[PDB]
Amino acid sequence: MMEQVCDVFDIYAICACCKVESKKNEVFNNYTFRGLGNKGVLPWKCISLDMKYFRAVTTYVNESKYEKLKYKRCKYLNKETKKLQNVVVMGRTNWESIPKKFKPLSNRINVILSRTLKKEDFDEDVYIINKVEDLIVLLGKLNYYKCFILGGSVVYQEFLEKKLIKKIYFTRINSTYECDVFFPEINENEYQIISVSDVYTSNNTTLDFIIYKKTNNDDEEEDDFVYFNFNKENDFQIYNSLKYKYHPEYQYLNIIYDIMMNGNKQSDRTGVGVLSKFGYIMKFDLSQYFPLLTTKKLFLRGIIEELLWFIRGETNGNTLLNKNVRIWEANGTREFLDNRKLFHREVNDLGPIYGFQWRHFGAEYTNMYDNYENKGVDQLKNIINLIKNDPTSRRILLCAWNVKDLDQMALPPCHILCQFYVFDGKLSCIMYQRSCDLGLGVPFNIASYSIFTHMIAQVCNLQPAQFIHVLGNAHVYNNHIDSLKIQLNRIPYPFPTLKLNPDIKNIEDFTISDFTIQNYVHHEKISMD
Amino acid sequence: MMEQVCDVFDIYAICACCKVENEVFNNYTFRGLGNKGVLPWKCISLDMKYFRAVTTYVNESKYEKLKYKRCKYKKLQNVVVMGRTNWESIPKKFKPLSNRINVILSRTLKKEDFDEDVYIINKVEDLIVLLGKLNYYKCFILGGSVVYQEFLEKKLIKKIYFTRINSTYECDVFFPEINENEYQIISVSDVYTSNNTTLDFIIYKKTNNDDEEEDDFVYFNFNKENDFQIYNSLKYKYHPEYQYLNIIYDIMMNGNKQSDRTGVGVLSKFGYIMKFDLSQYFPLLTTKKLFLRGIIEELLWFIRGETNGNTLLNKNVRIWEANGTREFLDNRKLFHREVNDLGPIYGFQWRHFGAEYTNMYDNYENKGVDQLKNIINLIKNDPTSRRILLCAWNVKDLDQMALPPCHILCQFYVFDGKLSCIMYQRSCDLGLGVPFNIASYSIFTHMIAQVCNLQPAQFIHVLGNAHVYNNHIDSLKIQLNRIPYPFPTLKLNPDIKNIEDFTISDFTIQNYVHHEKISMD
Ligand SMILES: NC(=O)c1ccc[n+]([C@@H]2O[C@H](COP(=O)([O-])OP(=O)(O)OC[C@H]3O[C@@H](n4cnc5c(N)ncnc54)[C@H](OP(=O)(O)O)[C@@H]3O)[C@@H](O)[C@H]2O)c1
Ligand SMILES: NC(=O)c1ccc[n+]([C@@H]2O[C@H](COP(=O)([O-])OP(=O)(O)OC[C@H]3O[C@@H](n4cnc5c(N)ncnc54)[C@H](OP(=O)(O)O)[C@@H]3O)[C@@H](O)[C@H]2O)c1
Ligand SMILES: CCc1nc(N)nc(N)c1OCCCOc1cccc(-c2c(N)nc(N)nc2CC)c1
Ligand SMILES: CCc1nc(N)nc(N)c1OCCCOc1cccc(-c2c(N)nc(N)nc2CC)c1
Ligand SMILES: O=c1ccn([C@H]2C[C@H](O)[C@@H](COP(=O)(O)O)O2)c(=O)[nH]1
Ligand SMILES: O=c1ccn([C@H]2C[C@H](O)[C@@H](COP(=O)(O)O)O2)c(=O)[nH]1
16 A cells, blocks of 8 residues: 655654663563653753764755655656755754754754744744644655654654654663653664664763664675675574674674574583684673673672682682672582592682682692792782883783683683783773573673772772673583573663772772672673573 | 577586696696597586586576566476487486486487477577577586587587596697687685596676675664786685685785885785685695695704704705894894804704704704604694693893794694694784695694594684785786686605605695796795
8 A cells, every 4th residue: 555654755753762760670671671751851961972873864865865865755746747945843842952053953854843832932943843744745755765763752742643653863871860751661672673783881871873674563796795706505583584783792692593593403511502603702892881790680799709718818618608609609519629539628629720720820739728928920910010110011811711720720710811902091801701601691701800800900000991802612502492582582781881980999809889880781680490 | 689599598618628638827728528439438427416406496476587688588497408418428327417408419319209398409590499498497508519610600608617637637629719809707615626637617707898684784784894807707616725815815805014034015914814624625725826835845954853954955946045144143132143044943943952053063862852753743642732832932042043943833622533733923924925734734734643643634724914915916916817727736756755855856746737936026
């Protein structure tokens, strides 16, 4: 049949939404991001990246695309056939919140909705309209590329109600501010997310940009591509329905996907069996976000305590258990130690694992209570020294794989080494991981080495840049498959941030209350079994 | 002015050429077309699969524009043009070629044979008239040396789809020398192994002598910020050597300027990965000449557990020379170390990790951890282990080494009779060291695979601090504008069944085609 008005006239909404104030265990969904305005203005001071994106989207035209849009509009209306511009439509209140120096919005055809004001009341080159229908009539008369509904709660509400919106360009501002007006609850039957962007920081908040779409209910050289592909040989509907998956959480999600679809079926030490592949790299920009997975719920207390226990050079499992952190519990039982032929090892004496190697590489391990002060190589101090005093060194490495002591460890380390890189007052870190449990271990391990990059950067007067995560044997356990099918069909939220107490200037001086995660928005806890 | 015949009728050549019976190499090296009135080689499956696929493909919803142009000047198919000898060359199982408009070009052939679809022609220009009379997608020449010779003299060819067969055969007929001024290469494919040869697919191009979500792409890039003319002029650079060259290109464009320990200065970035498929090729760079005797001897000297630099020096392998001098060792504060006693470096750590180092002459038999044997046992007896690692980075021993290792560790992976290897490298001199390093650990992966009765799969090379020295910049500009040749292969003596038994003569590099040596200095 004859198609609808949003399509012919290319009418979109663009908005920015923050999180809203209503005061441990809270539930997040798309509706979490809904705050539009407060007391006639925006809830926040300035978010310049959203303003830059807004400007980019609302001013962009493709001239060679116009001809086809022209024909289409003419055809729909039964008709023969300055620089091209977009139309922008604002509510009256919206129009009045904008400072005069910015009105009318440059390089766009401005249009205000109003009953109480008429063309006489405006000095500016703008079109006044008093009915939504009158917008449509105008779009028939104007030459323009696209039409963006710039907002106002009232304006948004009515355009979505009359189904005049083809795509919503929606910015998720990942912070909380006092709000009095709200974006309307979007119906999932009517609109689905098709694109999610990278995550960014601007003005002390993370944000991303997503695109909702209205639901389904040269010439020679492109042939050369098909030639070069001559030798190419249901569970992820949502995951596969996304056009642009640029959120960095997709680095992790794409690897699971790849292991699930193309991984090798293998037995393993545990007896569970896995799907495995060999050799991946992920990169997280810590200047922009803290990459805590949002597709399921993670907590950070344990892994921080673990890291503090590493830095103190400890190998005593009782220390963790006494803080109700059980990450190493299974690896310290009588039964487990005896299976490792460690019959003369005390329960929870984990042997010369991470802490011991970081502080005392090469010392003879005795028992977990011994005093090892000044024995072996204090690699941790050495790397901090090298970062401060020879930042361009290519030898800044922290290594836990001590070949000589492997058999005395409760189990050999998975996280083999850290290599550090300094440029322009910024610290980056590569961690190489020999064995990577994708469903359970990896999300924690990303968090751990991201925290440790921040710690090391701070005590060295640098800013953290990239955590780069190298996976050797990357594997999905079979008892994890169904849980990860659920996970890969969840859409990430903008990442949270990590704040460290800025007064901590030595690696040893950190305690648990020196760390806070801010603005963690996540899907529900999944049990992997 | 008035646009050209081949630009209208879409006339393409498609060949496969081999090499023919201290040499310099060029594109002309691959020119071997035919012999005895047949193909030089027994059968090259993959190229045949490529051949079919290229010449049978049509995009129907793109004929409309091609119809438009050819007039202005059921079952849509392609014109395949062949000469008489070539038509006679094919057995009649396949004749006339499946799904295509077979057209034979013979100034003698008795026209009135099977004349439903076989279209004989006697003159040269008669084809372009017969193309006008037809509903065809693209026109392919596959003729023979002379059929090729003429269509090229006549400038009728738009693109050459050229398969480079990387082996040497007896030939009597040859593809004409393509003129560098008149055709340039625009695309280069992955490298493959088919029927005991490597090959790749290149494309010469004639030198001029719902877009809703397309906008969303532009929206997502709102926040983005002639030295490489030939490099940049390629559309499709799929040859695996581009993993190496792209990394150089990247460091060059976006690297960070840094001082280093040496005083030369570098452009550096942090963290890359390259992957080479050893089942298909030996990844010995072809954009400059590389030698391998030295690096093999080094690997043999590693496997023996040696730390004596004199052993290499006496074989005229000077890789470790500069690190064994009196001045170098003293700069390391190794005032009590004999010249060329490199300390507990790779060999020592692979066979004796954790033993006490005394001097290069001592006997360390059964001292320390023999990692090399452990990883061989693990690979043979526990191949799904996730612990198969060989680590040279011994923290206790670093200061005793002439220098700390660049190649931190290898990790091994086994599935389906196949061995892969990751080597992590903390420090990567892109211009000089990395090319040897790829080769060295590739060979080592072959070595370990063989003695464990496995087949090599991937070598995977992870780069920490990756840097281009400033003194290499100009040499690398020249290198990045050279187009790779299909890779050689490595043959190991199959009799060798233990890691300790290889010697220098057990290794053969075959069909190494390369550009001219570059001196990086
Ligand atoms: N964060 C974002 O993405 C975003 C975007 C835009 C605006 N804002 C914020 O949102 C708030 C404004 O929202 P709001 O809902 O209160 O006001 P609004 O939607 O901007 O304006 C509503 C007014 O526009 C006129 N109007 C609306 N629909 C009409 C129709 N069909 N026909 C005729 N006139 C019509 C009426 O004007 P009269 O009163 O003149 O009759 C009405 O009172 C402010 O806080 C602003 O800062 C936020
Ligand atoms: N690897 C590859 O790319 C490839 C592909 C195909 C074939 N080949 C090989 O190449 C060899 C054949 O090469 P070739 O050049 O000697 O033979 P060819 O080009 O296949 O055939 C030559 C014949 O075509 C006819 N012909 C040539 N020019 C003509 C013109 N201007 N007008 C009309 N007819 C013309 C002549 O037949 P009459 O004068 O007798 O009528 C001539 O004897 C074979 O060994 C074959 O295996 C290689
Ligand atoms: C918040 C920006 C935004 N972002 C997304 N993604 N969608 C929207 N509809 C949107 O608002 C559109 C309403 C516009 O509001 C104001 C309110 C006060 C000031 C300014 C403002 C500013 N300070 N400097 C510049 N140069 N120009 C403007 C006008 C665009 C804008
Ligand atoms: C080397 C093949 C080749 N490759 C590139 N790239 N271009 C060429 N023009 C070309 O020659 C193509 C000319 C004709 O060749 C022959 C010669 C003998 C046998 C067969 C042959 C075969 N044996 N089995 C199958 N099933 N089907 C065919 C015919 C397609 C092909
Ligand atoms: O921080 C950790 C610790 C362990 N593992 C996983 C990887 C393996 O599934 C298992 C260790 O088994 P081996 O690879 O050591 O066999 O634990 C992680 O992913 N991260
Ligand atoms: O096999 C090797 C050995 C050395 N290097 C280079 C990397 C550095 O440029 C230099 C070692 O210097 P440090 O990074 O150790 O300072 O040698 C390689 O690329 N490959």
